[PDB]
mmCIF file with all atom_site columns, C-alpha atoms in Angstrom:
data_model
loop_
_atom_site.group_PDB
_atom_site.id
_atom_site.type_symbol
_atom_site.label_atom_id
_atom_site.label_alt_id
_atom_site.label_comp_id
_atom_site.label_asym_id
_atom_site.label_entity_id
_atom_site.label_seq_id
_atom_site.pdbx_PDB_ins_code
_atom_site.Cartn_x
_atom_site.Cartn_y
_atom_site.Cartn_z
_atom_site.occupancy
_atom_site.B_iso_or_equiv
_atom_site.pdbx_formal_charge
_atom_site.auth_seq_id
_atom_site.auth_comp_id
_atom_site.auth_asym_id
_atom_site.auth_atom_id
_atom_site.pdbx_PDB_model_num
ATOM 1   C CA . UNK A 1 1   ? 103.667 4.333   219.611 1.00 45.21 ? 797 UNK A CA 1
ATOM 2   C CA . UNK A 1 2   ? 105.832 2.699   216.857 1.00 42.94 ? 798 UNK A CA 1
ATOM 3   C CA . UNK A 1 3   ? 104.165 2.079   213.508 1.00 44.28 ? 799 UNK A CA 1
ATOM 4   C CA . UNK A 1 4   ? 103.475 -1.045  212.006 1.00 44.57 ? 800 UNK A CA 1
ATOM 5   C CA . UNK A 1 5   ? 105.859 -0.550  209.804 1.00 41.87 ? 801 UNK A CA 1
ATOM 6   C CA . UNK A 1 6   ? 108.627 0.692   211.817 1.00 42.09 ? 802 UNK A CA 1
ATOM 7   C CA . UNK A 1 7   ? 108.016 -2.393  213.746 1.00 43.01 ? 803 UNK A CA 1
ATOM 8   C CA . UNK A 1 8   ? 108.510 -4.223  210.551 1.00 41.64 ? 804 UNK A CA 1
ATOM 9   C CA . UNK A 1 9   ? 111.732 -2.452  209.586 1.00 40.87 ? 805 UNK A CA 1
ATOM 10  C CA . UNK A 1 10  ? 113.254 -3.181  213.438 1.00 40.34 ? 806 UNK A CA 1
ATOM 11  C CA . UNK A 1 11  ? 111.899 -6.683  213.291 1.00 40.27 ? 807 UNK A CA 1
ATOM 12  C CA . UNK A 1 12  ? 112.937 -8.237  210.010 1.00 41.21 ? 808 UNK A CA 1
ATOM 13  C CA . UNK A 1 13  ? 115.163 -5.493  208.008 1.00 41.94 ? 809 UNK A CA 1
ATOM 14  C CA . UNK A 1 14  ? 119.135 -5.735  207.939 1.00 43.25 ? 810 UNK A CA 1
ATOM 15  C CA . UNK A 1 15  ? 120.637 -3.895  204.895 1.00 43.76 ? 811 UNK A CA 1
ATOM 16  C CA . UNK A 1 16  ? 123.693 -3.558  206.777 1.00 42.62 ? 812 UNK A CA 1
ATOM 17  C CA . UNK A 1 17  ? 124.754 -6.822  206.334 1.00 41.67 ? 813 UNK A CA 1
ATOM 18  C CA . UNK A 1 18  ? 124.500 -9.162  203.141 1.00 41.03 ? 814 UNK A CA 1
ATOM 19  C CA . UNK A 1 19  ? 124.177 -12.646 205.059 1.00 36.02 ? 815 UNK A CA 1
ATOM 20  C CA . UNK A 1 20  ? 124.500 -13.795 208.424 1.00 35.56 ? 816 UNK A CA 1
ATOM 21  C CA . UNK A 1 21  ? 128.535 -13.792 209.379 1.00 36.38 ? 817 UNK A CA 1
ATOM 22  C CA . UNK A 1 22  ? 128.156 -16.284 211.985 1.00 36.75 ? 818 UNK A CA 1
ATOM 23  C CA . UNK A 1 23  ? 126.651 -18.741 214.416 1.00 35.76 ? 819 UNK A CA 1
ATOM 24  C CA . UNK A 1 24  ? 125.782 -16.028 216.715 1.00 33.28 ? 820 UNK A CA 1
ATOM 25  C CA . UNK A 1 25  ? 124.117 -13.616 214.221 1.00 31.41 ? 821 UNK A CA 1
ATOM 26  C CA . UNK A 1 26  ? 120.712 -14.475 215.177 1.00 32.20 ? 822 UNK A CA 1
ATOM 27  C CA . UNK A 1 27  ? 121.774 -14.514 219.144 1.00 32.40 ? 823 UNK A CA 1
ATOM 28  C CA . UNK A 1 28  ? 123.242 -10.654 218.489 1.00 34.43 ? 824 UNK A CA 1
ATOM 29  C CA . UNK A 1 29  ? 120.275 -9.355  216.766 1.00 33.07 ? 825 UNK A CA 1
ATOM 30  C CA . UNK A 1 30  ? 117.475 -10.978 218.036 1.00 34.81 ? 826 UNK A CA 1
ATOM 31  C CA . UNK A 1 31  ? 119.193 -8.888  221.298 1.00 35.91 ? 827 UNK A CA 1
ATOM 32  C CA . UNK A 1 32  ? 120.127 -5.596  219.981 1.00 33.80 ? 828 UNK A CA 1
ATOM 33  C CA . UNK A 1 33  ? 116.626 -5.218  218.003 1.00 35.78 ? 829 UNK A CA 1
ATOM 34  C CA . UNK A 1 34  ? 115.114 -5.742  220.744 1.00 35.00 ? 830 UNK A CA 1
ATOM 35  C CA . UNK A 1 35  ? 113.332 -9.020  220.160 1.00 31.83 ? 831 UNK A CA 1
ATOM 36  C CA . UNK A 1 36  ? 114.228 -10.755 223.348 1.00 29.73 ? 832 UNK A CA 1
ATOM 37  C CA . UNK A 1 37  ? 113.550 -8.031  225.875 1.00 30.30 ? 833 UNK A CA 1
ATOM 38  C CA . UNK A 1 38  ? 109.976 -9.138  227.324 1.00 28.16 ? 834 UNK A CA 1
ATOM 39  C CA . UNK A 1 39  ? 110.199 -12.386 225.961 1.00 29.62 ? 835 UNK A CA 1
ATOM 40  C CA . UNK A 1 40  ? 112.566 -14.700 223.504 1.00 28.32 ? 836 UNK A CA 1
ATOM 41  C CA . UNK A 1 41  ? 110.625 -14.502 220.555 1.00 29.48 ? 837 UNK A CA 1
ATOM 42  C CA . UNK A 1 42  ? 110.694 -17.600 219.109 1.00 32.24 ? 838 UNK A CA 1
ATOM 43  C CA . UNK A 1 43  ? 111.268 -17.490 215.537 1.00 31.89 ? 839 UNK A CA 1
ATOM 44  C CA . UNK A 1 44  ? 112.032 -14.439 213.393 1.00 31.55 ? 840 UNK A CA 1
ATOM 45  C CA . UNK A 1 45  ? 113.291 -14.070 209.736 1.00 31.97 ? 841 UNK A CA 1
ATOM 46  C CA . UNK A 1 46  ? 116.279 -11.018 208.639 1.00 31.24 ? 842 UNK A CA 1
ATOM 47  C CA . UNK A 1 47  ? 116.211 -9.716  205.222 1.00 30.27 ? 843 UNK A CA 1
ATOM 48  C CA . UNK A 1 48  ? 119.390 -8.757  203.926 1.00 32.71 ? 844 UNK A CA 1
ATOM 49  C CA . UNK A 1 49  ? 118.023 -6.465  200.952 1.00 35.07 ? 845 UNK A CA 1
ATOM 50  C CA . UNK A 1 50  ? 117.829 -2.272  200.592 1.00 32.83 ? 846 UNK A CA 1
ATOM 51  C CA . UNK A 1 51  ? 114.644 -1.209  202.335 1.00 34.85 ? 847 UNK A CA 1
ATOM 52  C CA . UNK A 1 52  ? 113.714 -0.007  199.061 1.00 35.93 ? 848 UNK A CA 1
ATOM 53  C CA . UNK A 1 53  ? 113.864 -3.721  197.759 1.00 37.74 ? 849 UNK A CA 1
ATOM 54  C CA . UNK A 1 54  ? 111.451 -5.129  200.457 1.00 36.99 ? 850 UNK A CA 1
ATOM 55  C CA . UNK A 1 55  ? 108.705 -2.209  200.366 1.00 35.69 ? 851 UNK A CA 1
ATOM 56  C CA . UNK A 1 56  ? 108.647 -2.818  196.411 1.00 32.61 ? 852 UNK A CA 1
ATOM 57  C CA . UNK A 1 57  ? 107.007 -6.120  197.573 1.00 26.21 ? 853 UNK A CA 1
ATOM 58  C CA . UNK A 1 58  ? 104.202 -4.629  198.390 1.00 23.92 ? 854 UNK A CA 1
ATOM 59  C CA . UNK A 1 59  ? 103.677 -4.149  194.567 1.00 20.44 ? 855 UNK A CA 1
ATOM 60  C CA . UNK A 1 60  ? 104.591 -7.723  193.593 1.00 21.19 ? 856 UNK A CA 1
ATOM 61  C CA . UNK A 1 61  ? 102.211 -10.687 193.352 1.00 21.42 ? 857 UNK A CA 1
ATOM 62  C CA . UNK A 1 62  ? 99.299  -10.952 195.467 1.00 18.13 ? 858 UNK A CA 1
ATOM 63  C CA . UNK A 1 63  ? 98.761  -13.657 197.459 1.00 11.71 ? 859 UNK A CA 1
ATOM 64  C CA . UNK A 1 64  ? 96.879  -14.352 200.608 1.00 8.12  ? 860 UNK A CA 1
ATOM 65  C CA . UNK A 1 65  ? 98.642  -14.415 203.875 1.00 8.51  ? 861 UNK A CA 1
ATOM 66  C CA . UNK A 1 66  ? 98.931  -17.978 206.329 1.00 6.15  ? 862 UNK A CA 1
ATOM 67  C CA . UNK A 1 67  ? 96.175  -16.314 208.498 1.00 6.01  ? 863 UNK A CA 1
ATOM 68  C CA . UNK A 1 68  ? 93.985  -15.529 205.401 1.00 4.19  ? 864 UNK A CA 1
ATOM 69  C CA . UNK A 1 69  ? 94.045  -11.774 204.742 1.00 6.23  ? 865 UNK A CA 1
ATOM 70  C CA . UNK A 1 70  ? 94.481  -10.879 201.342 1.00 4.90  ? 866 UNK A CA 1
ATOM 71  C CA . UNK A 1 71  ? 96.691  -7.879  201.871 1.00 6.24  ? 867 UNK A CA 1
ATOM 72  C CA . UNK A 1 72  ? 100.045 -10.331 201.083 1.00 5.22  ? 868 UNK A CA 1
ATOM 73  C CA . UNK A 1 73  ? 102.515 -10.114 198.656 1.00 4.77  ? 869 UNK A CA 1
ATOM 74  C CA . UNK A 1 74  ? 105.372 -12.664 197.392 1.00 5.93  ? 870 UNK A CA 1
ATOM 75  C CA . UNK A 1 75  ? 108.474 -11.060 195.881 1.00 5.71  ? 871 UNK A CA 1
ATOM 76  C CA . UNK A 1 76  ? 109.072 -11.834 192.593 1.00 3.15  ? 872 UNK A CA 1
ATOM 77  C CA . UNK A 1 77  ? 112.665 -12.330 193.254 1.00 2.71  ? 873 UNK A CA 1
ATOM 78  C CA . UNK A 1 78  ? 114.515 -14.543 195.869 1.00 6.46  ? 874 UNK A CA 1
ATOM 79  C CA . UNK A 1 79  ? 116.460 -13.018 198.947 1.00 4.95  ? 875 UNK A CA 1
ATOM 80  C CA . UNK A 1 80  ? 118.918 -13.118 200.884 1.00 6.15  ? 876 UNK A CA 1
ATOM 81  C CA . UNK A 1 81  ? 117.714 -13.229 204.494 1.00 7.44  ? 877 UNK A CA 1
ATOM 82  C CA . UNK A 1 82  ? 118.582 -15.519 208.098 1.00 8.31  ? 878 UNK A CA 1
ATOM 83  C CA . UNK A 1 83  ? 116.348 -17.828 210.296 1.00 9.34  ? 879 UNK A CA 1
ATOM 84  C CA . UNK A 1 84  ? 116.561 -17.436 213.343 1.00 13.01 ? 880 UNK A CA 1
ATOM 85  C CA . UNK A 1 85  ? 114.354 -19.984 215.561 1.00 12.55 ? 881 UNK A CA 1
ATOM 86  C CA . UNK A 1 86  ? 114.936 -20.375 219.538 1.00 13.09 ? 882 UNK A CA 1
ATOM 87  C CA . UNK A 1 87  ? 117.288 -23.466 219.931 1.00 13.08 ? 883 UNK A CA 1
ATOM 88  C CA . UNK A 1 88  ? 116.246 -26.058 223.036 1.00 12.73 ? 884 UNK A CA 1
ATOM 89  C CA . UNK A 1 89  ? 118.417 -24.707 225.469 1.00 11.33 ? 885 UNK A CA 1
ATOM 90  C CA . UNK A 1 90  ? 116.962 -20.902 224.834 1.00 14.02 ? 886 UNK A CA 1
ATOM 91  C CA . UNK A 1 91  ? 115.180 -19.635 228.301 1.00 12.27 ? 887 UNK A CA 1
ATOM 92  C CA . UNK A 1 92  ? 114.307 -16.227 229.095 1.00 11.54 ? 888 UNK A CA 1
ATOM 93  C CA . UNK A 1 93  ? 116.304 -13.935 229.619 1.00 7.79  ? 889 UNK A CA 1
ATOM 94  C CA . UNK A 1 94  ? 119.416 -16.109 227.757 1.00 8.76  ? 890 UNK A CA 1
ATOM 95  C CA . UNK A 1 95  ? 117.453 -16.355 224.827 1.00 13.90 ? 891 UNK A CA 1
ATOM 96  C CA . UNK A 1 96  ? 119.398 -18.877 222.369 1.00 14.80 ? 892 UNK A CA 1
ATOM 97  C CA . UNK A 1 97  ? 118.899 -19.305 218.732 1.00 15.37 ? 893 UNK A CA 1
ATOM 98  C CA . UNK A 1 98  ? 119.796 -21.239 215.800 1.00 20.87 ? 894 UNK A CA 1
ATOM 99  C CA . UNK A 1 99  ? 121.033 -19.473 212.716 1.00 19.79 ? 895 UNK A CA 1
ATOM 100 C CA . UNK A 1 100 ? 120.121 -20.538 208.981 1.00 18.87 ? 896 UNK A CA 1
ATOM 101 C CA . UNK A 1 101 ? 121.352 -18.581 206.044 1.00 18.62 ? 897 UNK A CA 1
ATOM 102 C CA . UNK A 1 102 ? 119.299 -19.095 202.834 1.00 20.40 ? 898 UNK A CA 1
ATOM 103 C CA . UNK A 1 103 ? 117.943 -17.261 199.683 1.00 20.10 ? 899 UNK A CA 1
ATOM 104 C CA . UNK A 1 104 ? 114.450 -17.453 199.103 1.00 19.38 ? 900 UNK A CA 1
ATOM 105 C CA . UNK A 1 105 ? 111.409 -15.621 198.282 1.00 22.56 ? 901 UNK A CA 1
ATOM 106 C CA . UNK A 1 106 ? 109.597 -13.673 200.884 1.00 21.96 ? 902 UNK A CA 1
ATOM 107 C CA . UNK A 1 107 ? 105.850 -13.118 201.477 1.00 22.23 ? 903 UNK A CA 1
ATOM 108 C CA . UNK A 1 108 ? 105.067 -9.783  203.363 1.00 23.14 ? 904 UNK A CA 1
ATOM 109 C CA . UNK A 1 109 ? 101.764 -8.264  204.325 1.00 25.65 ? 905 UNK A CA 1
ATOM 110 C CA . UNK A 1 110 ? 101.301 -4.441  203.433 1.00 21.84 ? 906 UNK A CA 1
ATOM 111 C CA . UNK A 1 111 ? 99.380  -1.466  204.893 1.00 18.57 ? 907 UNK A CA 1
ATOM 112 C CA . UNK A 1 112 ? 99.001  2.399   204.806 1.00 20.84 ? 908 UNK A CA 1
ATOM 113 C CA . UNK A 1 113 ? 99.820  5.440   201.836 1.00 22.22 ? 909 UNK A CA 1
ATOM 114 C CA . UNK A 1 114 ? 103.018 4.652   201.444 1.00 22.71 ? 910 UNK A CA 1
ATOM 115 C CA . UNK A 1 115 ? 101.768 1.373   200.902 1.00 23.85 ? 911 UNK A CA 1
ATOM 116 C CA . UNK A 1 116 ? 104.739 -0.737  202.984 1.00 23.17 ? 912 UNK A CA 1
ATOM 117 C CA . UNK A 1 117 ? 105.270 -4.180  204.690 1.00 20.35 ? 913 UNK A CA 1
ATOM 118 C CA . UNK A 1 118 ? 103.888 -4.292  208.035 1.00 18.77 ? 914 UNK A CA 1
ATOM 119 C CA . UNK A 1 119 ? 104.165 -7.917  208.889 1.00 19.52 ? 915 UNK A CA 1
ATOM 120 C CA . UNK A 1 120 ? 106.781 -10.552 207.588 1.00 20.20 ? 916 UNK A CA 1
ATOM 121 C CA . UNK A 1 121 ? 104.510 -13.839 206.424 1.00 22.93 ? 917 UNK A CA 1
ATOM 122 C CA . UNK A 1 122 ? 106.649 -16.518 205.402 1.00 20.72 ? 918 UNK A CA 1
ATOM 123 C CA . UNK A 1 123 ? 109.759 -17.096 203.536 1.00 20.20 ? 919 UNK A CA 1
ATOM 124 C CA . UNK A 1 124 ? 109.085 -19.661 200.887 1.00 23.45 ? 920 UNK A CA 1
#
């Protein structure tokens, strides 16, 4: 079954684009990565960094996670990455979401040898 950190990568990586190009970025991806297939997930953050970039968090400064594990990281630098959050008239299976562009820090939790994000945290 996928990895945790495959799931991470499918979930919350997009190094093919540098920002969100439009209103129906989050609507687009949140299909076509498969996010919206059981369910509409509800909220769910794209980073639009090099893979590279994001696993390097996992060597950046330790902090713990919202749930309390201490296996977190903050990046050092700021982002680029898009909110996406379910707007009111999202119901399954037209899921519907609201787009936010910003630049800001992540927090990612990491796992395994390569030691590599496995859950997205927070953006902060």
């Amino acid at each position: 079954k996928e990895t945790a950190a495959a799931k991470f990568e499918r979930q919350h990586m997009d190094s093919s684009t540098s920002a969100a190009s439009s209103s129906n970025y989050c609507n687009q991806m949140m299909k076509s990565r498969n996010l919206t297939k059981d369910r509409c997930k509800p909220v769910n953050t794209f980073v639009h960094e090099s893979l590279a970039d994001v696993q390097a968090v996992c060597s950046q400064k330790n902090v713990a996670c919202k749930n309390g594990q201490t296996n977190c990281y903050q990046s050092y630098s700021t982002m680029s990455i898009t909110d996406c959050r379910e707007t009111g008239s999202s119901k399954y299976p037209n899921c519907a979401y609201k787009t936010t562009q910003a630049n800001k820090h992540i927090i990612v939790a990491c796992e395994g040898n390569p030691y590599v994000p496995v859950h997205f945290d927070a953006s902060v």
